[PDB]
C-alpha cells in the first residue's frame, strides 16, 4: 500500500506564484522519478514535468517550459512545483504520480489525491432557493463559494434524487439544482460559508 | 511533439460484452502504451503499462495488443464497475504525450426525456428576479440540445447546462437548462433528442 | 561492398554539414576514433545528422583538422551521461538535453538484430572475432 | 553559453535567432562555428536527402560538462559515467546498437529472478562444502608466499599470507562486452585465459569483481560480470534520454550484484537456466563448490557426445563454473586474509583438466589447439615448480604418491623431473599387478591412477611412454572390471550431494577411462552391467525410484559410453601415439571401425575390426559368429599392403621348469563366440607367466577357463605380430 498526499492549491490572482508540495507514504523517495500531471475541468489529461531521481535534471512539457520551476529532495519526501508567471490558462487540477520503474516506458503506477488551483479575486456571498411546480425539483442560484448540500425530505428518497453539480455564471457566482420524480415534499438546501438555509414547500399550482 | 488520436470517442455496451478502444499516434512508435482509468471525480489509476502487461489491483479481465502503429485495449468481460473515461499514453518518444480519451457508459434498454417546465416566480418576483427553468429527466443517450424562443446566449444563462451522472438503476441522465433574467429585462423549451420523432416543444408565455 | 576508413579530413565546419551521407554512397563502413588520450582537450565539435539512412555522428577537431565518424547511438548516449550527472547544473546544460531528448525521434530505429557467432577477443583488440 | 535554433533553406547560409542564456560567447563567432574556445558545439542536422530544406539546431556547451565530478572501503569498484574519461576507443568503433544489441530487444526480459541457490540475508555468502576450510594457526606465522621445503609440507595444511592483494594489486579499467555497459574500474587480482578453435574464454578477477567473457565459434558470446551489491550499472541503449536502464541480471544480493551481458536470456538459451548462471557467484565462496558442479556436468556431456558432438549449453555452464571458482578463491582469500597451499596447487591442475574437457568435448575444437594461461598475483607457479624440481632431486604409499604427482602435474611447463615420471611408471605397474588379482579400486587408488596417466600423456623416448602405458590402461579394463568401474560412477552420481560434498572425477576414475576400447558399448557388456547392478544394494534401489526400467538400460549405456569416448575418442591422443593406424588412407581409423587398438613395438600396432580389413596382416578367428566376427590385424607405419598370416599353436612350459621368461611382452586375448571381447591381459612378468601355466590354479581369472563358459577361447598375441593359440 503506497500513498501520496498533495498539499497546495487555493485561488491566486493572475500573474503570481504558487508552490504545490507532495507527501510520500511508505515509498522511498530516492528510488524512482516523479510526475506532475495536469487535468483541466471538462478537459483531458496532459503530462507536465518529470524530476529525475533525487535532485536532478527535470524534463519540462512544451506549454509551460518558461513559467515552471520544479525541485525535489529525498529528505522530507518533498517534491514541489513553482508556477512563477503564467496566469490565465493554468487553472486546472494537478496530480502527483510516480513512474513505474525509473524508465518512461511503463508510465506511472503510483498516484496522489489531488489539488485544485483556481485563478480569481473573490469573496463569499448568500444563496437563494425557489420552489418548483407542479418530477419535483428545487433551484439554487447565485452563491459563493462551494459547496451547497441539497437533500430531499428525510431518508426515503435515495432513488430519483439527482443533485446537479455547480455551474459558474458570468457574474462570478455558481448555480445548481436537485430533483426527484413522483410519476408534497420539501427541498433541503444548506450553505456552509454564508450560513443560509431556505426551505420551500412543494404544492402544485395553476399553469397556463 | 506527438499527437494521440483515440477511437472510438465513446462506447456504450451491455454488461459482459467485449469492448475495444484503440489509440492512434502521429509517430511510428514501436511498443509501449500506458492505459489509465479515471472514474468521474476520482483520481486516475493505471491498468496496462505496455500492451498485454496488466498487473495492479484492477481485475485481470482486461488485455491488449498491437504493434508499430495502433495499439488496442480489449475488455474480455464488461462489468458495471467499469464505468469511467479511458485515456492512453505513448511513452516510446518522450517530448510529451497523452490520448484524447474515450468515455465508456454502461448501457441496457433505452428511455426518452420527459419534458416539464416551471413557471412560478411568486416568492421571487418581489425580490427583483424571476426564474423559469426546464428539466430533462431520465433520458438516454446523452445528446440533447435546448433552445429557446428568445435568442440563446450567455446573458440568459441558457448556455449554462449541468448534467448529473447516470442513475445507479436505469443508467439515465438528467438535464437542466436554467433561464434567469436579473432585474427582469415568448419563451419555450426546445428539446432535440433522438428518442423523439420531432423536436417537440413545451412552451410558456407571459 | 565499398568500405570506409572511418576518417576524412575537414578544414572548415561548413563542409561537414554539406558532406553527403556515408550510408548513401557506401554499403558497409567502419567507425574510427581519434588518436588522443583525452578527447575533451582535443575536441572541437559534435555534428549529428538525423535524416540519413543510418544517422551519422561526426566528431571534428580544429588544430588536427580531422573529422571522425563514431557510433551514432552510443556517442550521443555517452554524451548525455557525462552532461546528465546530478552534480552538473546550469542553463547551458538544460538546453543541451532538451535538444538531445528527441534526437532520434524522427530517424531510423536502432538494431533489433542478433550478433553473428564466433569467438570474441577482449577489449584489447576491440572485440576482434579471433579465437587465438 | 549560446543556444541557436536555425532553419536551413538552400546552400548559402541559414536563418536563425540567438538566445544566450546565462553567459557570453562571441556572437560574431556564430558566423563560423566556434572552434576557437575551449567549449564544444552540438549540431543536430535534419535534412531530407530528397533535397528538401528541413532545419538544424545548435547548442554551444562548455568543456567541464564532459569530465566527471575484509571490506569494500579501501579497495572499491568504481563505475564510470561515460566513455570520456575512460577508454573511449571501443565505445565509438563498436558496432553495437547499429548491427545488433548485445541485450535482448525487450527491456522487460532483462530483470531475472534469483535462483533458490542464491545467497540470502541469513547466509550472506552461501553454502560451503563439508570438508571445511582449516582455521589459521593461532601462534604460528603466515609465510608471505606458498612454499614447500619438504615432503611433509604437501600433506599437512600449509598456510601463506594474503598480503599479495593489499600491496601487489593492480588498478585497471575493464570494458564490458561490445560497449554494452560503460567502463568499470577494479583492483586486479588474477586473469585467466582458455583458448581453442571452437572457443575462447577470458576471465578477469579483482577485488569484489569478476569478468568472464565466454565465447564460442559456433555460438553467441556472453559476458558474466560480478560487482558488489551496492554498485549499479547503466546499460547502453539508443535512447538519448537521461534515464536509466539496468542491464540483464537479478536483484542485488546480500553481498554481490550479478550482471549478464548476452542475448541468451530467452532467444538463445535452451532453458529457464538463464537465471541459473546469474546465481553462480552468489552460491559459494568455496572454490571446491564450483569445481564440483563443473566436474559433475563434465562427465554428463561425454555420454551425450553421440547425438551432439557440440554441447552449447554445457560449454557455458562449465566455463562460467571455472571462472566463478577462481573468483571465489581470490575473494575467500581477501576476506579471510589467509590462503592454503593445496588451494593454489589445485587451481593449477583444475585449470588444465577442466579446460581440456571444456574445449574438446563441449566446444568441439581440435584437442591439438587446446591451451590455457593463468596469472594470479597470490600464486607464483614458476617458483613452486623450482621448489619441486629440487625436492625430487634430493616405498611410497598411494596417498603420498597422489600428492607428489598431482602437484607435479599441476605445475609443469612441460618439463617434468626424471624422478616424477619414474614414480608414475612405478604407480601404474603396481595398480596393474594388483588389478589382475582383485576386481575393484578404492578412491585412494583411483586418484593415484588418474594423475599417473595425466603425467605420462602430458607431453622416441617420451613417445614410447604414451604407447606402452596405453596398453596397460587398456589391459586393466576387462569386461569383468569395467562393469565394476561404470558401477562406481553410477553410485557416485546417485549418492552425490552437490551442496555438502565435493564431486571430483579422479575419484570416479578407472583404467577404462584411460583405455582404448570402443567396444564396451556393445549389447553384451551393457546387459552384463544391468545384471551386475543389484550387487551394490543401495544403488539398485535409488536407480529404480527415478528412471524407468527402459531408462536404466539407457543410463547404463550412457555410463558405458564414457570409457570409449574418453581417451579412445580423442583424435589428438591417437594420432601421436599410434600414427601407424592412420598411415595409409584408412576408413576404419576415422570411421571407428577399429574397435580396439593395441600398441606393439615401434612402427607397429595390433587392432580389432568388425568388418572387412582393407590393410595390414590379418588374423581371422574362425570360431566366431559370421555376422559378428573378430579379426586381429597387425598394422605397420610404412607398410600399407594387405595379406593374411597363419594362426600357430604353442604350449606352456612347466611353471617351475624354465626360470627363464620368453613369454613376457605378449598379450592374452580372451573372447566369446558371440563376437564379444572380454579380457585383454598383458604378461608383464615371470610371476604372471607362471600364473598362465596353471589353469584353475591361477589367481588371475581370465587365465583360468574354469570360471568361464564353454565359449571362452584364448589367443596369444606377440610383439612380432605373430598370433598363437594355447593348447590346454
Ligand atoms: C581532459 O581535458 C579536460 C578539459 O580539457 C579536463 O576536464 C577538466 O576537469 C576538471 C575537473 O577535474 C574541471 O575543473 C572543474 O571546473 C569547475 C568550474 O566550475 C569547478 O567547479 C570544479 O570544481 C571541482 O573541484 C574543486 C576542487 O578542485 C571542488 O572544490 C569542487 O567541489 C569540484 O569538485 C572543477 O575544478 C575543468 O573545468 C575541466 N577542464 C576544462 C577546460 O573544462 C580533463 O581533466 C582532462 N583529462 C585528463 C585527466 O587529462
Ligand atoms: C609483490 O610483488 C613483488 C614484485 O612484483 C615481489 O617482490 C613480492 O614478493 C610480492 N609480494 C607477494 C608476497 O606476493
Ligand atoms: C586402498 O588401498 C590402498 C593399498 O592399495 C590402501 O593403502 C588404502 O588404505 C585403501 N583405501 C581405503 C579406502 O582403505
Ligand atoms: C616372433 O616372435 C616369436 C616369439 O617371440 C618367435 O618365435 C618368432 O620367430 C618371431 N617371428 C618372426 C617372423 O621373427
Q: Where along chain A do its domains lie? A: 1-121, 122-207
| Residue to mutate, D36, D40, D64, ligand 1, most ligand atoms under 8 Å from C-beta | D64
Residue B168: CB partners within 8 Å, gap ≥ 6? none
If asked whether residues B65 and B143 sit together in one domain, one would say no
In the three-class reduction of DSSP (H, G, I as helix; E, B as strand; rest coil), residue D595 is classed as strand
By DSSP bridging, strand A58-60 and strand A45-51 are antiparallel
If asked whether residues B18 and B97 sit together in one domain, one would say yes
- Cβ atoms of D469 and D456 closer than 8 Å: yes
Contact D108 B94 (CB under 8 A): no
3-state helix, strand, coil in chain D (%, to 5): 35, 20, 45
Task: Examine the fold and report which residue of B60, B83, B107 is the final residue of a domain before the chain moves on.
Answer: B107
Where does chain A break, by residue before each gap (C–N > 2.5 Å)?
134, 183
Residue of D nearest to B94 (CA): D241
- The count of domains in chain B is 2
D415, part of any domain: no
In the three-class reduction of DSSP (H, G, I as helix; E, B as strand; rest coil), residue B71 is classed as strand
Alpha-carbon span C60 to C12, nearest angstrom? 10
Q: Which residue has the cell 430533462?
A: B136
Question: Would you list the DSSP string of D303-365?
Answer: HTTTT-S--HHHHHHHHHHHHHHHHHHHHHHHHHSEEEHHHHHHHHHHHHHHHHHIIIIII--
Task: Examine the fold and report which residue of D346, D379, D412 is the final residue of a domain before the chain moves on.
Answer: D379
3-state helix, strand, coil in chain C (%, to 5): 25, 15, 60
Ramachandran region of residue D594, left (φ > 0), alpha (ψ -120 to 50) or beta? beta
Supply the residue whose CA is at minimum distance from atom 45 of ligand 1: D67
Alpha-carbon span D600 to D588, nearest angstrom? 18
Distance from CA of residue D55 to its chain's centroid?
59
Phi and psi angles of residue A42, each rounded to the nearest 5 degrees, phi first: 80, -15
- Cβ atoms of D93 and C32 closer than 8 Å: yes
By DSSP bridging, strand D2-8 and strand D55-61 are antiparallel
The CATH code for residues A1-121 is: 2.60.40.10
- Cβ atoms of C93 and D199 closer than 8 Å: no
Alpha-carbon span D290 to D286, nearest angstrom? 7
Task: Examine the fold and report which residue of B37, B72, B107 is the final residue of a domain before the chain moves on.
Answer: B107
Alpha-carbon span B110 to A108, nearest angstrom? 38
Alpha-carbon span D169 to D162, nearest angstrom? 11
- Cβ atoms of D365 and D196 closer than 8 Å: yes
**Domain range for D15:** 2-61
In the three-class reduction of DSSP (H, G, I as helix; E, B as strand; rest coil), residue B82 is classed as helix
Q: Is the CB of D307 under 6 A from ligand 3?
A: no
Phi and psi angles of residue B84, each rounded to the nearest 5 degrees, phi first: -170, -175
Give the H or E element holding residue B203: strand B201-204
If asked whether residues B9 and B97 sit together in one domain, one would say yes
Tell which atom from ligand 3 comes closest to the C-alpha of D399.
7
Alpha-carbon span D281 to C38, nearest angstrom? 36
Angle formed by the axes of helices D312-336 and D287-303, to 10°?
170
By DSSP bridging, strand A136-143 and strand A174-180 are antiparallel
Task: Examine the fold and report which residue of D326, D361, D379 is the final residue of a domain before the chain moves on.
Answer: D379
If asked whether residues D6 and D90 sit together in one domain, one would say no
If asked whether residues D180 and D300 sit together in one domain, one would say yes
**Domain range for B162:** 108-206
Alpha-carbon span A40 to A118, nearest angstrom? 10
Residues of B in contact with C102 (CB under 8 A): 93-95
C-alpha cell at B73: 485495449
If asked whether residues B33 and B69 sit together in one domain, one would say yes
In the three-class reduction of DSSP (H, G, I as helix; E, B as strand; rest coil), residue D474 is classed as helix
Task: Examine the fold and report which residue of B86, B107, B128 is the final residue of a domain before the chain moves on.
Answer: B107
Contact B114 A135 (CB under 8 A): yes
| Residue to mutate, D160, D164, D334, ligand 2, most ligand atoms under 8 Å from C-beta | D164
Angle formed by the axes of helices D549-565 and D479-494, to 10°?
110
- The count of domains in chain D is 3
If asked whether residues B87 and B137 sit together in one domain, one would say no
If asked whether residues B121 and B183 sit together in one domain, one would say yes
Q: Is the CB of D67 under 6 A from ligand 1?
A: yes
DSSP assigned state of C124: T
- Where residue B191 sits, what CATH number does that domain have? 2.60.40.10
Residue D543: CB partners within 8 Å, gap ≥ 6? D490, D494, D533, D552, D555
Compute the residue count for chain A.
208
Angle formed by the axes of helices D341-357 and D287-303, to 10°?
20
**Ligand 3 mean position, distance from CA D444 (Å):** 6
C-alpha cell at D454: 595425466
Question: Would you list the DSSP string of D66-112?
Answer: TS----SSSS--EE-SSSSSS--THHHH--BTTTB-SS-S-GGGTB-
Q: Which residue has the cell 581370465?
A: D702
Q: Which long-range contacts (CB under 8 A, 24 or more apart) does A159-167 make?
A: A159/B167, A159/B169, A162/B137, A162/B164, A162/B167, A162/B174, A163/B164, A164/B162, A164/B163, A164/B164, A164/B174, A164/B176, A165/B162, A165/B164, A166/B162, A167/B160, A167/B161, A167/B162
In the three-class reduction of DSSP (H, G, I as helix; E, B as strand; rest coil), residue A106 is classed as coil
Residue of B nearest to D243 (CA): B94
- Cβ atoms of D590 and D518 closer than 8 Å: no
Shared fold status for A1-121 and A122-207 = yes
Q: Is the CB of D164 under 6 A from ligand 2?
A: yes
Distance from CA of residue A183 to its chain's centroid?
35
Cis, peptide link before residue B2, omega less than 30° from 0? no
Alpha-carbon span D190 to D194, nearest angstrom? 14
If asked whether residues D209 and D347 sit together in one domain, one would say yes
Phi and psi angles of residue D68, each rounded to the nearest 5 degrees, phi first: -70, 160
| Residue C83 vs residues C93, C97, D64: alpha-carbon distances, Å | 7, 8, 9
Facing residues of A179 across strands? A137, A162
If asked whether residues B86 and B54 sit together in one domain, one would say yes
Angle at A103 between CA A98 and CA A108, to 5 degrees: 30
Task: Please name which of C102, D150, B133, D656 lies closest in space to residue A179, comparing C-alpha atoms.
Answer: B133
- Specify the fold of A122-207: Immunoglobulin-like (2.60.40)
Tell which atom from ligand 1 comes closest to the C-alpha of C37.
50
Facing residues of D677 across strands? D671
C-alpha cell at D565: 569416448
Name the residue among B49, B95, B154 with its Cβ closest to that of A106: B49
C-alpha cell at D301: 556431456
Alpha-carbon span D612 to D610, nearest angstrom? 7
Compute the residue count for chain D.
728
Alpha-carbon span A47 to A92, nearest angstrom? 12
On the 0-12 / 13-18 / 19+ scale of CB atoms within 10 A, C18 is exposed
If asked whether residues D649 and D697 sit together in one domain, one would say yes
Longest CA–CA span in chain B (Å) reads 68
In the three-class reduction of DSSP (H, G, I as helix; E, B as strand; rest coil), residue A94 is classed as strand
Resolution (in Å) of the shown entry? 3.9
If asked whether residues D335 and D307 sit together in one domain, one would say yes
Cis, peptide link before residue D367, omega less than 30° from 0? no
| Residue D429 vs residues B195, D449, D703: alpha-carbon distances, Å | 108, 10, 19
D521, part of any domain: no
DSSP assigned state of D134: P
Tell which atom from ligand 4 comes closest to the C-alpha of D720.
1
Residue of C29, C41, C75, C78 to mutate, interface with D, max D Cβ within 10 Å: C78
Task: Examine the fold and report which residue of D379, D409, D438 is the final residue of a domain before the chain moves on.
Answer: D379
Give the H or E element holding residue D174: strand D170-174
Cα-Cα-Cα-Cα dihedral sign, residues D76, D82, D83, D85: negative
If asked whether residues D39 and D184 sit together in one domain, one would say no
If asked whether residues D601 and D662 sit together in one domain, one would say yes
Instruction: Determine the straight-line distance between the first and last CA of chain A, rounded to whole angstroms.
Output: 62
If asked whether residues B121 and B177 sit together in one domain, one would say yes
**Is A159 at the interface with chain B, CB within 8 A?**
yes
Q: Is the CB of D144 under 6 A from ligand 2?
A: yes
Name the residue among B100, B137, B161 with its Cβ closest to that of A44: B100
Amino acid at each position: 500500500e503506497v500513498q501520496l498526499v498533495e498539499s497546495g492549491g487555493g485561488v491566486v490572482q493572475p500573474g503570481r506564484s504558487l508552490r504545490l508540495s507532495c507527501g510520500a507514504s511508505g515509498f522511498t523517495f530516492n528510488t524512482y522519478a516523479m510526475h506532475w500531471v495536469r487535468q483541466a475541468p471538462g478537459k483531458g489529461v496532459e503530462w507536465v514535468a518529470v524530476v529525475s531521481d533525487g535532485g536532478g535534471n527535470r524534463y519540462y512539457a512544451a506549454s509551460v517550459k518558461g513559467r515552471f520551476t520544479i525541485s525535489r529532495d529525498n529528505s522530507k519526501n518533498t517534491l514541489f512545483l513553482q508556477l512563477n508567471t503564467l496566469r490565465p490558462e493554468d487553472t486546472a487540477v494537478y496530480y502527483c504520480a510516480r513512474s513505474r520503474g525509473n524508465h518512461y516506458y511503463y508510465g506511472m503506477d503510483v498516484w496522489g489525491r489531488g489539488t485544485t488551483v483556481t485563478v480569481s479575486s473573490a469573496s463569499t456571498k448568500g444563496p437563494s432557493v425557489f420552489p418548483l411546480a407542479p418530477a419535483l425539483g428545487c433551484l439554487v442560484k447565485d452563491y459563493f463559494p462551494e459547496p451547497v448540500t441539497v437533500s430531499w425530505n428525510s431518508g426515503a428518497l435515495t432513488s430519483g434524487v439527482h443533485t446537479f453539480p455547480a455551474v459558474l455564471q458570468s457574474s462570478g457566482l455558481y448555480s445548481l439544482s436537485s430533483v426527484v420524480t413522483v410519476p408534497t415534499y420539501i427541498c433541503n438546501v444548506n450553505h456552509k460559508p454564508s450560513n443560509t438555509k431556505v426551505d420551500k414547500r412543494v404544492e402544485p399550482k395553476s399553469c397556463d | 511533439d506527438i499527437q494521440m488520436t483515440q477511437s472510438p470517442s465513446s462506447v456504450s455496451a451491455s454488461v459482459g460484452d467485449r469492448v475495444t478502444i484503440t489509440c492512434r499516434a502521429s509517430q511510428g512508435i514501436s511498443s509501449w502504451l500506458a492505459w489509465y482509468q479515471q472514474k468521474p471525480g476520482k483520481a486516475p489509476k493505471l491498468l496496462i503499462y505496455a500492451a498485454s502487461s496488466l498487473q495492479s489491483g484492477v481485475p485481470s479481465r482486461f488485455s491488449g495488443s498491437g504493434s508499430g502503429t495502433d495499439f488496442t485495449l480489449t475488455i474480455s468481460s464488461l462489468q458495471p464497475e467499469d464505468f469511467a473515461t479511458y485515456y492512453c499514453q505513448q511513452a516510446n518518444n518522450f517530448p510529451l504525450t497523452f490520448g484524447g480519451g474515450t468515455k465508456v457508459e454502461i448501457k441496457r434498454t433505452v428511455a426518452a426525456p420527459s419534458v416539464f417546465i416551471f413557471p412560478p416566480s411568486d416568492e421571487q418576483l418581489k425580490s427583483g428576479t424571476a426564474s423559469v427553468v426546464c428539466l430533462l429527466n431520465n433520458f438516454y443517450p446523452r445528446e440533447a440540445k435546448v433552445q429557446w424562443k428568445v435568442d440563446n446566449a450567455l446573458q440568459s444563462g441558457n448556455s449554462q447546462e449541468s448534467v448529473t451522472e447516470q442513475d445507479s438503476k436505469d443508467s439515465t441522465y438528467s438535464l437542466s437548462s436554467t433561464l434567469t433574467l436579473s432585474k427582469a429585462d415568448v419563451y419555450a423549451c426546445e428539446v432535440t433528442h433522438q428518442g423523439l420523432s420531432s423536436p417537440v416543444t413545451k412552451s410558456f408565455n407571459r | 561492398t565499398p568500405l570506409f576508413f572511418g576518417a576524412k579530413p575537414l578544414s572548415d565546419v561548413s563542409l561537414i554539414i554539406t558532406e553527403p551521407c556515408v550510408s548513401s554512397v557506401y554499403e558497409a563502413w567502419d567507425y574510427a576514433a581519434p588518436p588522443v588520450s583525452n578527447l575533451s582537450e582535443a575536441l572541437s565539435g559534435i555534428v549529428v545528422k538525423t535524416k540519413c539512412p543510418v544517422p551519422e555522428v561526426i566528431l571534428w577537431f580544429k588544430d588536427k583538422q580531422m573529422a571522425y565518424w563514431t557510433n551514432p547511438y552510443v556517442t550521443l548516449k555517452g554524451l548525455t551521461q557525462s552532461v546528465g550527472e546530478e552534480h552538473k547544473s546550469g542553463d547551458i546544460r538544460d538546453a543541451l538535453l532538451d535538444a538531445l531528448s528527441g534526437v532520434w525521434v524522427d530517424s531510423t530505429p536502432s538494431s533489433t538484430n542478433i550478433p553473428e557467432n564466433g569467438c570474441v577477443w577482449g577489449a584489447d583488440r576491440l572485440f576482434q572475432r579471433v579465437c587465438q | 553559453a549560446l543556444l541557436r535554433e536555425y532553419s536551413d533553406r538552400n546552400m548559402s547560409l541559414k536563418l536563425e535567432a540567438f538566445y544566450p542564456t546565462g553567459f557570453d560567447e562571441e556572437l560574431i563567432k556564430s558566423l563560423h562555428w566556434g572552434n576557437d574556445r575551449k567549449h564544444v558545439f552540438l549540431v543536430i542536422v535534419k535534412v531530407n536527402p530528397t533535397t528538401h530544406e528541413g532545419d538544424v539546431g545548435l547548442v554551444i556547451f562548455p568543456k567541464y560538462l564532459l569530465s566527471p565530478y575484509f571490506g569494500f572501503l579501501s579497495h572499491p569498484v568504481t563505475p564510470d559515467v561515460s566513455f570520456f574519461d575512460s577508454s573511449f576507443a571501443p565505445y565509438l568503433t563498436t558496432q553495437h546498437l547499429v548491427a545488433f544489441t548485445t541485450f535482448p530487444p525487450n527491456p522487460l526480459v532483462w530483470h531475472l529472478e534469483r535462483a533458490e541457490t542464491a545467497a540470502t540475508a541469513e547466509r550472506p555468502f552461501g553454502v560451503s562444502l563439508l570438508p571445511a576450510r582449516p582455521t589459521v594457526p593461532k601462534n604460528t606465522i603466515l609465510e608471505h608466499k606458498a612454499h614447500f621445503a619438504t615432503w611433509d609440507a604437501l600433506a599437512r595444511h600449509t598456510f601463506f599470507s594474503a598480503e599479495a592483494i593489499i600491496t601487489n594489486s593492480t588498478l585497471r579499467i575493464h570494458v564490458p562486452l561490445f560497449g554494452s555497459v560503460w567502463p568499470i574500474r577494479y583492483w586486479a587480482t588474477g586473469s585467466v585465459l582458455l583458448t581453442s578453435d571452437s572457443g575462447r574464454v577470458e576471465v578477469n578477477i579483482g577485488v569484489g569483481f569478476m569478468s568472464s567473457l565466454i565465447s564460442l565459434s559456433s555460438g553467441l558470446p556472453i559476458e558474466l560480470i560480478v560487482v558488489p551489491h551496492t554498485v549499479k550499472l547503466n546499460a547502453v541503449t539508443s535512447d538519448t534520454t537521461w534515464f536509466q536502464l539496468n542491464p540483464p541480471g537479478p536483484d542485488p544480493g546480500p553481498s554481490y550484484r550479478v550482471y549478464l551481458l548476452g542475448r541468451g536470456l530467452d532467444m538463445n538459451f535452451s532453458k529457464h537456466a538463464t537465471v541459473d548462471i546469474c546465481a553462480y557467484p552468489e552460491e559459494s565462496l568455496d572454490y571446491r563448490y564450483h569445481l564440483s558442479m563443473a566436474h559433475t556436468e563434465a562427465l554428463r556431456m561425454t555420454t551425450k557426445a553421440d547425438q551432439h558432438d557440440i554441447n552449447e549449453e554445457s560449454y557455458y555452464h562449465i566455463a562460467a563454473r571455472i571462472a566463478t571458482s577462481i573468483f571465489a578463491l581470490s575473494e575467500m582469500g581477501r576476506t579471510t586474509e589467509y590462503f592454503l597451499l593445496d588451494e593454489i596447487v589445485d587451481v593449477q591442475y583444475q585449470l588444465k583438466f577442466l579446460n581440456y574437457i571444456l574445449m574438446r568435448i563441449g566446444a568441439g575444437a581440435h584437442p591439438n589447439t587446446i591451451s590455457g594461461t593463468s596469472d594470479l598475483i597470490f600464486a607464483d607457479p614458476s617458483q613452486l615448480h623450482d621448489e619441486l624440481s629440487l625436492l625430487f632431486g634430493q616405498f611410497i604409499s598411494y596417498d603420498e604418491a597422489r600428492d607428489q604427482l598431482k602437484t607435479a602435474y599441476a605445475l609443469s611447463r612441460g618439463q617434468d623431473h626424471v624422478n616424477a615420471l619414474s614414480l608414475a611408471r612405478r604407480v601404474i605397474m603396481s595398480i596393474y599387478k594388483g588389478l589382475l588379482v582383485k576386481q575393484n579400486l578404492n578412491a585412494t587408488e583411483r586418484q593415484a591412477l588418474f594423475f599417473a596417466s595425466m603425467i605420462l600423456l602430458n607431453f622416441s623416448s617420451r613417445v614410447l611412454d604414451g604407447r606402452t602405458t596405453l596398453l596397460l590402461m587398456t589391459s586393466m579394463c576387462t569386461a569383468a572390471h569395467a562393469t565394476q568401474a561404470a558401477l562406481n560412477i553410477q553410485e557416485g552420481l546417485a549418492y552425490l550431494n552437490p551442496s555438502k560434498h565435493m564431486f571430483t572425477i579422479p575419484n570416479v576414475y578407472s583404467p577404462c577411462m584411460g583405455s582404448l576400447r570402443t567396444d564396451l558399448t556393445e549389447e553384451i557388456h551393457v546387459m552384463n552391467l544391468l545384471s551386475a547392478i543389484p550387487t551394490r544394494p543401495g544403488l539398485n534401489e535409488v536407480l529404480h525410484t527415478q528412471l524407468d526400467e527402459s531408462e536404466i538400460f539407457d543410463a547404463a549405456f550412457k555410463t558405458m559410453m564414457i570409457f570409449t569416448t574418453w581417451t579412445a575418442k580423442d583424435l589428438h591422443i591417437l594420432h601421436t601415439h599410434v600414427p601407424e593406424v592412420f598411415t595409409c588412407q584408412d576408413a576404419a581409423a576415422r570411421n571407428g571401425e577399429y574397435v580396439l587398438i593395441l600398441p606393439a613395438v615401434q612402427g607397429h600396432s595390433y587392432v580389432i575390426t568388425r568388418n572387412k580389413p582393407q590393410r595390414g596382416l590379418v588374423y581371422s578367428l574362425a570360431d566366431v559368429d559370421v555376422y559378428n566376427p573378430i579379426s586381429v590385424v597387425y598394422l605397420s607405419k610404412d607398410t600399407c599392403v594387405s595379406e593374411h598370416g597363419v594362426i600357430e599353436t604353442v604350449a606352456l612350459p612347466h611353471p617351475d621348469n624354465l626360470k627363464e621368461c620368453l613369454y613376457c611382452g605378449s598379450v592374452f586375448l580372451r573372447y566369446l563366440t558371440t563376437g564379444a571381447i572380454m579380457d585383454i591381459i598383458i604378461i608383464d612378468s615371470k610371476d604372471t607367466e607362471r600364473q598362465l601355466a596353471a589353469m584353475g590354479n591361477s589367481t588371475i581369472p581370465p587365465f583360468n577357463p574354469d570360471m568361464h563358459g564353454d565359449d571362452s577361447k584364448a589367443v596369444l598375441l606377440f610383439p612380432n605380430g605373430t598370433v598363437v593359440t594355447l593348447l590346454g
